[PDB]
């Protein structure tokens, strides 16, 4: 589906994607979100990092991906006691406040980088479980290397999966977001179906809770045949295809998968560039590279190779002169009048965003296009 001109460019963007991610990986193994963006620099997210790590693992850099998993594992083992205390509080009928929960931002030395009152999220822990299991399977690795950190994440998610939290976008703490539920589900199914983990004390529980997540989504997270952004809403969010691939609420051929891809395309995809959600005013609500990649990945997995390629091409067209991929671009803005104030406050849009590169690597690999 690609000529020599396109292939050369796509190959080069893959090589550069690998290079930029590994150049900016912290000494301790964390992947930063964006080394030069004011509001993100100095911090790591499990969400960004897990997708970045999966792109790097697919690319074949076992060493780099492993160092990320090492970093996460060690950070989580350090929270063994915090998690045990949260669980003990629950058992005493004293449910912890959001202010006491595990963090969203991490410093590179594994401390809280932000206050969870303001950004409490559970998705990243689910993503990490998915990521580490997938990596180990791909490369034939012994999960015992990372198991104690897996155990912390599992225990935490089994307790807290059903709690309201902010979405991937740091919005709406009172709601239960389907792509958050989906991320947790993906992680739980990954560990619950992993033969190396068959004897873990939580083995059966992970699949039972995954089933509970699917029940909740069936009851409150599907409208008019499609997934919705949060339980009890009617609208879609551009994150929702992740619920299909990779997180597996439904398979790619399911009607709800098809309808969800179609709804996201219709409501949020403009010319190949996918918006986050209709009300998005962040930088005016631009078109997100990672979301176009996510949709493309989902299209590839459904057999729509042409649609996948169209989204891959759109992403490639957003690379700057150095090959760096921004977080988002303003070719179409949902709320154009809101962009200037973001630029004025926080600077120009995060570029490179490592997650953009990670997602590019995943989509490229899905289409057989890694060099």
Swiss-Prot record:
Belongs to the glycosyl hydrolase 15 family. Keywords: Carbohydrate metabolism, Cytoplasm, Glycosidase, Hydrolase, Polysaccharide degradation. It catalyses: isomaltose + H2O = beta-D-glucose + D-glucose. It comes from the Bacteria. This is Isomaltose glucohydrolase. SUPFAM superfamilies: Six-hairpin glycosidases. The active site is at residues 167, 170, 327. It is found in: Cytoplasm. Pfam families: Glyco_hydro_15. GO terms for biological process: polysaccharide catabolic process. It is an enzyme of class 3 (hydrolase). Optimum pH is 6.7. Stable between pH 6.5 and 11.2. Transmembrane segments: none annotated. GO terms for molecular function: hydrolase activity, hydrolyzing O-glycosyl compounds. The keyword Lipoprotein does not apply. InterPro entries: 6-hairpin_glycosidase_sf (IPR008928), 6hp_glycosidase-like_sf (IPR012341), GH15-like (IPR011613). One of its GO terms (cellular component) is cytoplasm. Optimum temperature is under 35 degrees Celsius. Its main location: cytoplasm. Changing residue 327 to A: Loss of glucohydrolase activity. Substrate binds at residue 117. Involved in the intracellular degradation of the cyclic tetrasaccharide cyclobis-(1-6)-alpha-nigerosyl (CNN) formed extracellularly from starch. Catalyzes the hydrolysis of alpha-1,6-glucosidic linkage from the non-reducing end of isomaltose to yield beta-D-glucose and D-glucose. Can also act on panose and isomaltotriose at a lower rate. It displays low or no activity toward CNN and the general GH15 enzyme substrates such as maltose, soluble starch or dextran. Its EC number is 3.2.1.205.
């Amino acid at each position: 589906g690609l000529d020599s001109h396109e292939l050369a460019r796509l190959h080069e963007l893959a090589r550069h994607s690998h290079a930029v991610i590994t150049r900016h990986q912290d000494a301790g193994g964390a992947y930063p979100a964006a080394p030069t963006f004011s509001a993100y620099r100095g911090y790591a997210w499990l969400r960004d990092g897990s997708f970045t790590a999966e792109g790097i693992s697919r690319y074949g850099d076992v060493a780099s991906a492993g160092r990320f998993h090492d970093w996460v594992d060690g950070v989580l083992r350090r929270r063994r006691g915090q998690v045990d205390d949260l669980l003990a509080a629950v058992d005493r009928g004293e449910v912890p406040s959001n202010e006491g929960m595990l963090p969203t931002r991490f410093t590179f030395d594994g401390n809280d980088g932000s206050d969870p009152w303001w950004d409490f999220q559970t998705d990243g822990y689910g993503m990490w479980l998915w990521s580490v299991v997938t990596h180990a399977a791909r490369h034939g690795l012994d999960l015992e290397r990372w198991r104690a950190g897996i155990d912390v994440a599992v225990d935490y998610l089994l307790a807290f999966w059903d709690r309201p939290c902010y979405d991937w976008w740091e919005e709406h703490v009172e709601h239960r977001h389907v792509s958050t539920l989906g991320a947790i589900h993906g992680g739980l199914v990954a560990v619950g179906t992993c033969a190396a983990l068959r004897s873990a004390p939580w083995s059966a529980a992970t699949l039972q809770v995954a089933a509970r997540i699917r029940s909740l989504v069936s009851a409150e997270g599907v409208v008019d045949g499609h997934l919705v952004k949060w339980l009890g809403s009617s609208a879609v969010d551009g994150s929702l295809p992740a619920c299909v691939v990779p997180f597996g609420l439904v398979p790619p051929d399911d009607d709800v998968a098809a309808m969800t891809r179609a709804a996201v395309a219709k409501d949020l995809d403009v010319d190949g560039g996918v918006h986050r959600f209709a009300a998005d005013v962040y930088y005016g609500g631009g078109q997100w590279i990672l979301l176009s990649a996510l949709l493309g990945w989902n299209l590839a997995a459904a057999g729509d190779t042409a649609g996948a390629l169209r989204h891959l091409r759109w992403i490639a067209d957003q690379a700057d002169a150095d090959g760096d991929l921004p977080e988002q671009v303003p070719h179409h803005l949902l709320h154009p009048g809101s962009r200037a104030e973001w630029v004025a406050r926080w600077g120009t849009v995060a570029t490179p965003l490592l997650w953009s590169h990670g997602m590019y690597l995943i989509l490229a690999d899905e289409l057989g296009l890694l060099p």
